Amino acid sequence: TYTTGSFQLILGLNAPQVISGEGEPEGEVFASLASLEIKPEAHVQELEIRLDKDTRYLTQHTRNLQPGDTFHALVEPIGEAPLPRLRLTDSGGKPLAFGLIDQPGESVELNYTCDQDICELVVHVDGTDGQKDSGEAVYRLLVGINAPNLRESGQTPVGS
Amino acid sequence: RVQHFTGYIEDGRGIFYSLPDMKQGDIIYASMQNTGGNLDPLVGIMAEEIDPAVSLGQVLEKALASENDLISELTAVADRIFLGWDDDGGKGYSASLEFTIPRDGTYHIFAGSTITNQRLDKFQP
After folding, report:
1. Spatial distance between the Cα atoms of A62 and A67, rounded to a whole number of angstroms
2. Cβ of A94 and B93 within 8 Å?
3. Who among B67, B70, B118 is closest to A93 (CB)?
4. Does any CB of chain B come closer than 8 Å to the CB of residue A89?
5. Is-contact B44 B85, C-beta < 8 A?
6. Which end of chain A is more exposed for a tag (fewer CB within 10 A), N or C?
7. Contact at 8 Å (CB) between B16 and B49?
């Protein structure tokens, strides 16, 4: 099988002390990351959520995002359930984006782009507009990373 | 030319600092960090000293509904009140601001707290 984990990489140019494994960085750089030149693949996940009477607030955590990535999300109710509110916050709660209601007002969408070296995101879905006990409202949530065609995905959830 | 300060912020009440007689071409650097409590620093600069509490109260009062109800409103008000400001520039929620002095004159440095949310069960700025 393969293996997973973290690693430390030491690369040298005409410095035979690197192979000893104690080579301290020196000189001017000569290599850089290859991924920074281009764009990766798309990852899409769809989940079904239900907001009960006592569970009107729900939050989910997302994997770490590399710099330059993009994030998309949309919510569509199963039936006649009222449209809930959508927003995006980091792990500490700092707001980053808010959901926009489309002109065909049957879905709410969100968008964000990555600037920091590591971004951890949390998606909030809440229907606590008032204190109505609507009952068993159920919504469809679609989320994607580097997948701007979330509106018409067509393919089954790919990637991760 | 570096100076240190220490203070205390109570219920969003800011502290003013004056920088008398700066010259044209001068560049000002600022950094504010949290040393206790739940403070989230906010730094702003202005020419004439005026209390920002009145306008920030209007920002706080609009906690009902808007397009980007908090972030866009706070950015608009800050871009009008201050010539330069910074909310989150350092490691975490700390601030770090660079501002070049346009002309000859005296300016004021404002230190305080921004408007944030610290809850996941409900939104309350």
Report:
1. 15
2. yes
3. B118
4. yes
5. yes
6. N
7. yes
Contact B77, B59 (CB under 8 A): yes
Asked if B53 contacts B14 with a C-beta cutoff of 8 angstroms, the reply is: yes
Order of strands, sheet of A121-126, starting from the edge strand that comes earlier in the sequence: A57-61, A121-126, A85-90, A95-98
Q: Do A95 and B121 touch (CB under 8 A)?
A: no
Q: What is the Cα–Cα distance from B52 to B34, expressed in whole angstroms? A: 21
Mutate which of A60, A89, A98 to test chain B, going by most B C-beta atoms within 10 A?
A98
d(CA A120, CA B38): 21
Chain A CB within 8 Å of residue B116 CB: yes
Any idea what DSSP says for residue A92? T
Query: What's the reported resolution, in angstroms, to a tenth?
Result: 2.4
The experimental technique behind this entry is cryo-EM
* Distance between B123 CA and the closest CA of chain A, angstroms: 9
